[model samples]
Target: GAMAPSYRVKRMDIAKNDEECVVNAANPRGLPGDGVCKAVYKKWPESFKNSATPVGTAKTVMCGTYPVIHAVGPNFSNYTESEGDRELAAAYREVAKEVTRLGVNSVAIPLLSTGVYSGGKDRLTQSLNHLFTAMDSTDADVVIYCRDKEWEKKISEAIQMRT
Candidate 1:
């Protein structure tokens, strides 16, 4: 059997992440308009393709040498807590599945649905658990990157507490 995946929290831009695979918190329409998607597209336009990637689903594009997986998470303001949680879980699950399918050794993902999607700290806390469970199913080193120091601290604390 494969070893359990390793999890780490880093304070940095996802665009600078050098993992074998990068996961973008994409919009339902899969457009690189703002936030993570726009930053990623600025670096590798070839990997930022437009598609109908609905919430809880994922799509992949090759960023020249590596692959970028666009995982569409739900907008928390539009759903109940449970609904948002389920959607986020689905999105994380899809990202893990995609990474496993590609057989990548390392992957970097952001805190999905917690930005303009209005998924606050409550959602952030819950998301850590969901992401941990989903990514643990993969045989890769999973790094969760946060652009903000506060978020990085929160993630680090969450992981530390869990371990």
Candidate 2:
């Protein structure tokens, strides 16, 4: 009998991968504040820096081994009324393009805009679907890593629904 094609989703408390790059579903602010940014920063201290600041938004930093990319949207408290969703999706796409352009082999992504940004599973799934659809067509290996079991379930269900 032929087996079903399945992909396993994993959870991690820290950020460490053999890949060259990683995608953090975080705000512009770096680690020690909230989310997985701190773990990521601890893993690659050299890559953490506030060099490329996003204009008119939180100051974002890129810190990782292989051109770590940060996907930030409007802050949840203030972004609900604005076109924050579109802006966030756009940012994710732009970052994905940039990451792919850099010739990175693998990219690990978190749930973008889902935590402090207050983006729900639907929104996060939509944004990720858009970004991954664009990214998967390319040669870069995309790994969607989760911080907890709930997120893992949400992302897994979302991916299943998409496919």
Candidate 3:
């Protein structure tokens, strides 16, 4: 497998991962104070430093076994058809590029901002489509953490469709 297939997909919890990195769909403000970030951050002890990434960019912080792939999503707000999904794609690829650059070949991800934003199924489906498209351009063994059975199914379908 040369350890790469452009990208590979998996469904699981980022918190439980031992991958080289686990992504946090972070607020650009560098505070991990809300929603998914709250729980995810509780595990990450230190707050992100004040260097803000662009509205749709990423930053990485060393935490225990899995470094935190902190991505700057759109501010904590309502999820529109494009809000979180678009920012997510931007940060997703940025994280991919960074991980690949650092030779960290493995990483885990969530459905970007869908958690706090609460976008429904169609929104999730669209977000996965964007994510896979970005991942196909990378060389990391990327895992996308799904929140449930429904997400696993959709994530599977997205990977299948990519082929």
| Alpha-carbon TM-score of each model against the true structure | 0.90, 0.73, 0.78
Candidate 3 on 94-127: residue-level lDDT in tens? 8767676667767777766566554433357656
Tell me the lDDT of candidate 2.
0.58
Per-residue lDDT of 129 in model 1: 81
Judged by lDDT, which candidate is best?
1
Q: List the candidate 2 regions with Cα displacement exceeding 4 Å.
A: 1-8, 29-32, 55-65, 119-123, 161-163
The superposed Cα distance between candidate 3 and the true structure at residue 72, in angstroms, equals 1.9
The parts of candidate 3 lying over 4 Å away from their true place are: 6-12, 64-66, 75-86, 118-122
Model 2 agreement with the true structure over 31-119: per-residue lDDT tens digits: 44467766766665665566344512223344533566655655656665357766666666666676656776666666566676664
TM-score of 1: 0.90
Q: Model 2 Cα displacement at 126 (Å)?
A: 3.5
Ten residues in a row with the worst lDDT in model 2?
Answer: 1-10
